[PDB]
Amino acid sequence: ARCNYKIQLDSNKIVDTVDIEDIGEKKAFCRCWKSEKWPYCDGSHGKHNKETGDNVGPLIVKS
Amino acid sequence: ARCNYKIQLDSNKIVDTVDIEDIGEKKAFCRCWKSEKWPYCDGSHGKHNKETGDNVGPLIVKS
Numbered sequence: 001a002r003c004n005y006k007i008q009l010d011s012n013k014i015v016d017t018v019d020i021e022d023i024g025e026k027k028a029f030c031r032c033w034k035s036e037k038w039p040y041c042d043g044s045h046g047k048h049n050k051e052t053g054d055n056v057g058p059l060i061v062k063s
Numbered sequence: 064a065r066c067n068y069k070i071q072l073d074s075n076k077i078v079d080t081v082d083i084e085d086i087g088e089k090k091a092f093c094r095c096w097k098s099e100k101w102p103y104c105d106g107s108h109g110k111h112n113k114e115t116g117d118n119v120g121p122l123i124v125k126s
């Protein structure tokens with residue numbers, strides 16, 4: 001049971017790097033692998049959780 | 064097909080918040096929902112990807 005059906009399926013391993021000096025006030029990062037704005041959250045987690053009963057959600061990095 | 068079988072299954076929605084002033088040099092955050100050090104990566108993604116063919120990996124936040 002894989003988790004990612006959408007993001008860079010050609011890649012062997014998806015690791016994203018961000019510098020704190022690009023966060024601004026705050027940024028929300030996707031942990032559900034469904035965002036169309038990867039690696040940022042775009043709210044797609046909500047439909048996923050409703051359909052599946054899951055409870056996943058983003059990481060908020062703040063300043 | 065839910066993604067999270069491990070983290071706070073009582074919770075309706077798992078949103079984590081971190082302040083950049085707690086990153087230090089860098090921190091790696093789990094996006095595979097298998098870490099025993101949630102919300103940080105503990106390398107559990109590697110066994111998951113080997114078993115399933117998946118390609119998920121952490122978010123690295125650096126300074």
Ligand code: FES
Pocket residue numbers: 029030031032033034035040041042043044045046056057058059
């Ligand atoms: S779109 Fe994936 S966690 Fe929000």
Ligand code: FES
Pocket residue numbers: 092093094095096097098103104105106107108109119120121122
């Ligand atoms: S342990 Fe989950 S992304 Fe590394």
